[PDB]
């Protein structure tokens, strides 16, 4: 039915009028029952993670008591379904197995990774008191869960020697974006509090700010990376790798980013574009620009960063720095808006742009052109407000069809929920 995306290539319009630019469609269909939902009032579906493999997809969501950024975690649900076609205009889902992780009060975060008829879930846990009370924001180990169609899941426990992370960490959070599976290994992205014992020269790149350099005197850029203004603790990102995933004894290794080329740690994702790889890092401080890196392999040294702005995060932000010259300051954004590449150098890609309105939000869907142009279409004019987005394209009926998973509120007075949609990417040349 569906196949891993094969990128459009210019097979025409290569004479003189050669603007081979793709654009989104004109319809924004729905994908009902992507994951089980409810209608209770004291619930918030808050943290989604979506991934599509060769034919199957993995989906995970988080349910909180009353608050969306906080509150006791009622449960975490994972759905293993297959993308199929039932004669309707667009693609459709068909869950095969719904699963709830045991003891959801010990989890810090979770993410999924869909391969070839095989699903993976990796969750970081926190230290448990003598009574078993979860000591929040501590780190103890990992759980790796194996998923196969028509097959009971298998759980792997990773603790002690099984994980050797570069620096000593105290709290670890797995990026909600997820990961990939190549060969007999896995690749996620994690962030946490890392105790630094050297000099910090944090990355400080900003526009023409003339206040005091816009706080560009690097004291504030260093201040942002520090935990509570202490040099001894930092918030940093790091690659994560699992060895011998087939063997029943996996092992974990990490690779921490230098602060000299990074911003405060946040959620991110791992891509598998072409034969290369990719990584997206969500804004978490004054800098609200796009942060994407294309790497020949999975190594901090070999990572190369993109030089594009959109999508400029503009929601769930506390900053006040013009987006013409992002002037370093101090704030805490809590949004998420990833970009799915549509080329080998990722000069094509597609994203979801959210802009806040007097009330709620106004959103649009766009596909970035390598020439710098964009093609934008307004979407969801009924919903009160949406906050995050996640895209995962694929080949389906000799065409590129993408599924956008979002969360928000259709009615102002309803709790936060998760909504799924799909659209089409069509290639054409002027």
């Amino acid at each position, epitope marked *: 039915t569906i196949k891993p995306v094969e990128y459009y290539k210019p097979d025409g319009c290569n004479k003189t009028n050669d603007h081979f630019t793709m654009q989104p469609g004109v319809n924004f269909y729905t994908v009902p029952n992507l994951g089980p939902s409810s209608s209770s009032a004291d619930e918030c579906y808050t943290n989604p993670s979506f991934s599509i493999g060769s034919s199957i997809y993995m989906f995970s969501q988080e349910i909180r008591k009353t608050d969306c950024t906080t509150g006791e975690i009622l449960s975490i649900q994972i759905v293993l379904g297959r993308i199929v076609d039932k004669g309707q205009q667009g693609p459709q889902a068909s869950p095969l197995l719904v699963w709830s992780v045991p003891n959801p009060k010990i989890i810090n975060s979770c993410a999924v990774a869909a391969g070839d008829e095989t699903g993976w879930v990796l969750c970081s846990v926190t230290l448990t008191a003598a009574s078993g009370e979860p000591i929040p924001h501590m780190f103890d180990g990992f759980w790796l869960y194996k998923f196969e169609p028509d097959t009971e899941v298998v759980a792997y426990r990773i603790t002690g020697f099984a994980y050797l992370l570069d620096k000593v960490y*105290d709290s670890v959070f797995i990026g909600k974006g997820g990961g990939i599976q190549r060969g007999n290994d896995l690749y996620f992205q994690m962030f946490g509090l890392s105790r630094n014992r050297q000099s910090i020269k944090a990355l400080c790149e900003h526009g023409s700010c003339l206040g005091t350099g816009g706080g560009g005197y690097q004291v504030l850029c260093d201040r942002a990376v520090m935990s509570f203004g202490s*040099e*001894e603790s930092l918030i940093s990102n790091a690659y994560l790798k699992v060895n011998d995933v087939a063997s029943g004894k996996p092992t974990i290794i990490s690779q921490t980013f230098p602060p000299s080329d990074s911003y405060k740690g946040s959620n991110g994702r791992i891509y598998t574009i072409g034969e290369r790889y990719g990584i997206y890092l969500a804004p978490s401080s004054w800098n609200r620009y796009l942060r994407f890196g294309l790497t020949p392999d999975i190594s901090v040294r070999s990572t190369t960063w993109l030089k594009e702005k959109d999508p400029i995060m503009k929601v769930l932000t506390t900053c006040t720095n013009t987006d013409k010259d992002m002037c370093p300051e101090i704030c805490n954004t809590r949004g998420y808006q990833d970009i799915f590449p549509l080329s080998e150098d990722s000069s094509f890609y597609t994203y979801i742009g959210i802009t806040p309105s007097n009330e709620g939000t106004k959103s649009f869907v766009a596909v970035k052109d390598d020439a710098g142009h964009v093609a934008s279409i307004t979407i969801l004019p009924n919903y009160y407000s949406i906050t995050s987005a996640t895209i995962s394209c694929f080949m389906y009926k000799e065409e590129i069809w993408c599924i956008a998973v979002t969360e928000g509120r259709k009615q102002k007075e309803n709790p936060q929920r998760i909504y799924a949609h799909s659209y089409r990417v069509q290639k054409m040349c002027f």
Partner: antibody
Amino acid sequence: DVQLQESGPGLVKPSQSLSLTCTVTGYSITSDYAWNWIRQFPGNKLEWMGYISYSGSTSYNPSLKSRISITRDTSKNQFFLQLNSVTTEDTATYYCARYYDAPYYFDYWGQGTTLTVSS
Amino acid sequence: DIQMTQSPASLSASVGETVTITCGASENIYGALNWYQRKQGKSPQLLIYGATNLADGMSSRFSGSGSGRQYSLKISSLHPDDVATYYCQNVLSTPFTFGSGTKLEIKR
């Protein structure tokens, strides 16, 4: 709301070790925010003394060197304080505040507790 | 460490008059400066955070101003209840050092 109450002895012999306890109610320490220790000298002079974050990372005052030791107990929702050597200079009043992330204030200070050093 | 100079150490004025307190900083802090008031026998209390934002449950006469190195606090319509010590503190980064302190006096 959240309130901090200090408790401990009033007099300490020179060169000995003091103990202080700042019990917090209405919030949990492990949830967020840092919990500091500040002292005001008899000459109306204040001086920050250290802090202990929610994750467990502890920062200290460079001038006070290795003479300080901050701990915590999540079950009681309390965080203690220990000083190694105690000279006549250490006679002052000790408060326990909570460090809000931003806009960077110590909102929620304790009632205070006078400490004297003498044999 | 970071050092700030608080002056004048003491001031005198009559009811209904305006006064200003100044606190300079050794290096730029980008406005991460607080102000506190400590009435006699009581623990200090937040008055201004960020050098410009007022606090809750406080008079509207207190106003904050200043950016970069030098910062000041202003008191308008002096009231008898305003007899305490006013401090300036740096919260930009550890260690958090205070000012020398200033004592207000109402002349009559």
